[PDB]
């Protein structure tokens, strides 16, 4: 996260860290949506251009964390994966269309003050809050700038959703209805963005109607970090919600 600030304790209790077993390293962010399901970006697990193809036994999920590198004894919970489900029409060949994946935990995680699931939006929540100008929040342990290096603790930044035509005109990549972009424009003064290592983490909004936090997006891609006239792109969670439900309902 670039131009963000340290998160407060238990500020984002659905935040999950995807961690490689060996070598031991931070792969991506993710989010807790129930006691046994974690949501992330497909490209965190599968991306053939870079010879990335992780299976269940290659990763661990770390939940309820704050510090990036420390083992938070008696606070964080580490979980093994039972199975990974990547969207059948995830387009890694072209533009990361439908960049979403679900991960089923081997055992359910116990909720606490630092571990708690976020809600998934329904059609009305998406309709009311996914509007240009409305702000969401992104969290992660990713890079602090493009190229300190990486933060000591979880970072947070609030960003406004950007008009679809402006998103489209900022890049040469073909944008789809399964993505939305966010960030400040060059003349808006304020800055901020996700960066490398933040992928798969959640873009959330707090509903003013029922005061619940909803995950509207997943950090997907960007061309650099916090570059003027460029925006971060996120997977449109509500648009892929029927696929989410089907996986959870069937498995």
């Amino acid at each position: 996260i670039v131009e963000g600030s340290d998160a407060e304790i238990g500020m984002s209790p659905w935040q999950v860290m995807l961690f490689r077993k060996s070598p031991q390293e931070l792969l991506c962010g993710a989010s807790l949506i129930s006691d046994r399901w974690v949501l992330t970006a497909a490209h965190c697990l599968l991306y053939p251009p870079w010879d990335k193809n992780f299976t269940e036994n290659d990763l661990l999920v770390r939940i309820g964390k704050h510090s990036r590198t420390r083992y938070e004894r008696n606070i964080e919970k580490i979980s093994m994966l039972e199975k990974i489900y990547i969207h059948p029409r995830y387009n890694w060949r072209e533009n990361l269309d439908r960049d979403i994946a679900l991960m089923k935990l081997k055992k359910p995680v116990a909720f606490s003050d630092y571990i708690h699931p976020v809600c998934l939006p329904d059609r009305e929540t998406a309709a009311s809050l996914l509007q240009a100008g409305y702000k969401g929040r992104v969290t992660g342990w990713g890079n602090l700038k493009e190229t300190k290096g990486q933060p000591s603790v979880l970072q947070v930044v609030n960003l406004p959703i950007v008009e679809r035509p402006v998103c489209k005109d900022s890049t040469r990549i073909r944008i789809t209805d399964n993505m939305f972009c966010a960030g400040y424009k060059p003349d808006e003064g304020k800055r901020g963005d996700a960066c490398e290592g933040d992928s798969g983490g959640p873009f959330v909004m707090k509903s003013p109607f029922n005061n619940r936090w909803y995950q509207m997006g997943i950090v997907s891609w960007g061309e650099g970090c916090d570059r003027d006239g460029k925006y971060g792109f996120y997977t449109h969670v509500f648009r892929l919600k029927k696929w989410i439900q089907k996986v959870i309902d069937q498995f």
Partner: peptide, 27 residues
């Protein structure tokens, strides 16, 4: 169910330092 209500914030009726920024943007 209990989703999206944080134990250390919503559950206790405490606000985090920047959530107001979000709310103020929902016009």
């Amino acid at each position: 169910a209990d989703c999206g209500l944080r134990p250390l914030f919503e559950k206790k009726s405490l606000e985090d330092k920047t959530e107001r920024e979000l709310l103020e943007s929902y016009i």
